[PDB]
Paper text:
[name] (EC: 2.5.1.46) is a cytosolic transferase involved in the first enzymatic step of the unique post-translational modification of eIF5A. [name] catalyses the transfer of 4-aminobutyl moiety of spermidine (SPD) to a specific lysine of eIF5A precursor, which results in deoxyhypusine formation. For its catalytic activity, the enzyme requires nicotinamide adenine dinucleotide (NAD) as a co-factor. In physiological conditions, [name] forms a homotetramer.
Residue numbers in the entry:
A (entry chain A), D (entry chain A): 27 to 363
B (entry chain B), C (entry chain B): 28 to 364
Write the structure that this text describes.
Amino acid sequence: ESTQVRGYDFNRGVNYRALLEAFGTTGFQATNFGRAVQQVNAMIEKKLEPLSQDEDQHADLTQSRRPLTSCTIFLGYTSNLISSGIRETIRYLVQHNMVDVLVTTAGGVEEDLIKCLAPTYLGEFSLRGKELRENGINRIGNLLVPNENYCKFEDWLMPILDQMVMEQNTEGVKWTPSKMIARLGKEINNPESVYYWAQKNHIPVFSPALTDGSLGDMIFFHSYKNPGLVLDIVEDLRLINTQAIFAKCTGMIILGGGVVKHHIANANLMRNGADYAVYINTAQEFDGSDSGARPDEAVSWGKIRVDAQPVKVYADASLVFPLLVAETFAQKMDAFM
Amino acid sequence: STQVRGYDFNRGVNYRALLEAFGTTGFQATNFGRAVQQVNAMIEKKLEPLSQDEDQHADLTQSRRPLTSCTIFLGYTSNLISSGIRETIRYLVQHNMVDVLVTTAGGVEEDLIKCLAPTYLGEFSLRGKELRENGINRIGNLLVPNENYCKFEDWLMPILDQMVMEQNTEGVKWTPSKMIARLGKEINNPESVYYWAQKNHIPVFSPALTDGSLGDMIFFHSYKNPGLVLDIVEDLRLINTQAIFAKCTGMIILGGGVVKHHIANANLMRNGADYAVYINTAQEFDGSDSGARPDEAVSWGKIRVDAQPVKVYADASLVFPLLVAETFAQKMDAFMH
Amino acid sequence: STQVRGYDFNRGVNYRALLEAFGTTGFQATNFGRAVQQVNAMIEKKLEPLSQDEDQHADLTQSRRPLTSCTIFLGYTSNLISSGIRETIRYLVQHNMVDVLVTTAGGVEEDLIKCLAPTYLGEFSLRGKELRENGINRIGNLLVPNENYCKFEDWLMPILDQMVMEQNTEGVKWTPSKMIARLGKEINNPESVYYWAQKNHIPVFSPALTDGSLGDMIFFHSYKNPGLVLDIVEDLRLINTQAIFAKCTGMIILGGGVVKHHIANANLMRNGADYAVYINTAQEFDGSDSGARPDEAVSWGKIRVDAQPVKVYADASLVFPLLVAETFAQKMDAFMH
Amino acid sequence: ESTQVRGYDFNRGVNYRALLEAFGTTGFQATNFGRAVQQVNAMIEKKLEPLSQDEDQHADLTQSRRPLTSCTIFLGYTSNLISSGIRETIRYLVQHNMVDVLVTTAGGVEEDLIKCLAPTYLGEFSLRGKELRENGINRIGNLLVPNENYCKFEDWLMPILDQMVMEQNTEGVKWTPSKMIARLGKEINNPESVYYWAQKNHIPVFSPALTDGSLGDMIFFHSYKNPGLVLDIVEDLRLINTQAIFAKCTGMIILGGGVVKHHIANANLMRNGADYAVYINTAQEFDGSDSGARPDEAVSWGKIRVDAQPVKVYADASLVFPLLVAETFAQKMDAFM
């Protein structure tokens, strides 16, 4: 039962599918990439298995309109990836109903909406903050966002916050982050937006610290003009946890660390663990942080089943997530239509 | 022009002189020395008296806590509360040396649970399957038995019953910071960070408080005693007002994620912190907020252009007790009376 | 001003377009795109003809290898030769696409041994005790049986006997580069990097060649057949002359340590490389040469001030086959005839 | 058999010895630091055990004048640490004959000598290479070295290289790196120098790629004025390996990665493994590099005994090595005099 190390032979010419396939026998993180392709393809193939359970009960127990499949896939990603071109990548998966639950941080919501109003630009990591600040330019890694983008966001968002307060106070709406994100996706009304497609396809988005970013800034300023908006995080905890509890199987695809990683993993502890899991991040374990914990720490908690074969790829997801999608979801497009 | 020179142990082991020599040793030892200077600048500023004019503006908050000349925000990730840095943080809070805490849910939880049962030393390499089979959970190279959370459940559930009763019959509008104050009062134990925080009127912000064991318990509680609301909007106003009406601010941030961003974003509301120290092991190259250098925050206005912030690239379990030894602990008499 | 935009999989899986889209995706995907541009600039320069004047100066070396308009230095660490990147490197060397190799001792050794027996896939977490008890050596997530080195001993010892004989009776003055050429000729196998390097007159520098299995064998051999000398001074002249008399130079450096420094230092002798790509996962914060950004080398004169060098922060087992696919492999016809 | 997590209580005041002792129960890398203190103290205590073996045989078999002790300690460190203030730290250990073998890279030799002629200065990592180069300033991390330092080095070194060539050609001297380093230490004749003390105390220094740096540049330029110097690496392989083979016990203290780490570890494979080992570095395992390999990879090779209890501290050695020395060697100063 032994596989030999061998890399792609460019004497064959350039066949990119064969080149990507060769990662599996190349070693180090290339091999982990091949293992991740296999784990995600196992999630997809399980998802496509037919099932025959009670539609109305499920909906009652989860308080969700989304129909159950044979594998509930949780996709988590940090804010920076929505500032990156991986935004397109994630939007594709959600547009085609390929995942079931989204978890991201506040920036990961608002920068998708802002990109429908104005673009993000390429820059460099080493650009100095004094000069950028003096020019009204904000840096995100090697990306750049002008202050004017947030001005356009403000103008777009304040009338929606007005309606939200009115609906809460006179139509009994109890706002949560996931409910707000669904509404913003409907309002942005733009097929380039992740959250437009999420609400159209009844994919919920959880973001328990939704106030930590520009949407927070705007909610804050808005509240001195139109007081009273409340965002409850308790009901959203019930919604995410019941997505895990009532699943047939679950898979986790987690890009980055922080709350998005922990929140997906903790939901899956409710069912004594995910059946499949892929982490892609650059965090290291040695400082004891949750972000840097290997999948095998999650096993000790019951967040990943002891019989699962989870995979971590240690790499920037801007490089590896498009390749992963290319070899997995994008190959199964036939079945998602 | 300062020359590189390390401590000369031919002098013997003079600990203070050895620590002072980090400044001229280079690499992260020099950044450690710069961090000592930055924190001592925050303390020196904090102990200036407020002028009449400054006192007027600073008094503009409804906070019970007396205002000082430098409001210090201390942020830390959950793993650090599982570590012995819990004692370091507790000491600072106990003696009113910082003014605002920001942490994640684990960072609240695990302080309270340590008053019920201890955390143990283990190894990073322990395998999740065998740990899970023995009911032992791993946090880096630390270990918490399942039983710890059983005791937490027994302790917490009667409090949740009281909180719901107070909500529904006494008009209480819970937020994360108000719950954390109450949990600190209930734990009633001088070893607890949150006990001292509520005693000293130090607010604790944790916008994703539902992401861990507290969340598990609220979740199960919601089925027997439904309706608890935790609003994050009111807490956003509260943390942002702490920054807006400060005479000066300092940020001391251990780790990344929400704690780092939430503190920094609040300080953007005053066009930047005056002083800032980051201690973490995250790298910038993947674009993550966690790995962003202080100079990225300058571009946003989260750190003032004329500030001299510092990042120490190191595990805070090593650096933070040394930093406190060289700064706050040296001025303890000033924080007493 | 280039806008951020990721590949849109609604277009289908067009691999070339997906790779081209890394440039506008951000973070390290953008650095990957910049690295493709840098390497293609080296190749475009290499394929310019030499003017009369340039030909005159470049001809000033005693190298059998025809001079070109860009001398490309390729450096890589030993682990990459244990990986399937050995095939990638072999292809470039086979088709004369680079001009100078620099590696460590393992980087020589393990190429030769792979012609005698394979390397296998394993896992990073396998425990050393059980591996040692089974005579299995671990390299990251790769595995080499002890037997591999027995075969290497049987192969190498008769060659060492001949080298000593040629030293003592034919005046040969061995250096690392001369031994590596001889080992490549002896292995006589088209799967070997060093076979093709000596066939194509590509010198290989490895100033610490005694640091691994070759060293073990020289050591034991020294007791039966004493006196072998390996001079590193002559090799220093040889590598430095490759830089000094180049029309232009490019550096492609995979990993850190001696391979990175030795290539960069040689190029200081011409006041800097014209083009440079680093691929590695080292961080700058500990001051290590391995983690130093290209811009540190600019301060020394190792990279020209007007160059646009690039570092991709990633495991080269993922990135380097993609880089070659987008650069050298696209111009293969130009390197043939 | 369980130890509870507890940090230092600053309500005790500031006792730095107690603070450092508390690292052991603080967790994460603080705990690994405590384990490293224990491993190095075990090396020292073993070294001090008396022994009673044949003095003349030992010297014959090792071709060394250094007397055997009960534990042979190998100390390795990368170049950057000699540019840092850790130079003083290492010099102290060698001055007092506390370690037995030194391994470093070329920069780690020459920058100790240059510091006896002119100092290294503090700077910042972010200083731009163009401006530094235009001012004749070279950057090493956040340290700075003027070009003039290398001019002074040249003037000092060229007459010594003259004598070395003369002694080789007319007194039969066969130069190796360790023999050259001993001579340079004798010539520098300055008690601030590591290598002055090493040669005085008959501590050999191995550096198989000694030509990779400024000493190489100078040897290179010198050879066009005074040709013929040869530096053999084979005889130095015999000297380092016999230090391991004939030891009673061995310990490895390795700061950084690269050749210094591999070369010490490979020598100890000759005796089927070191009895004690401490690594301090910031390299990560996931790219398969030797630098980032955990001690447990070395166990699979036989480089560390299966019954050893090695320790890696993941941290910048500029921070932790002075603390480690303070708690170990500097406490045992009594016995080394």
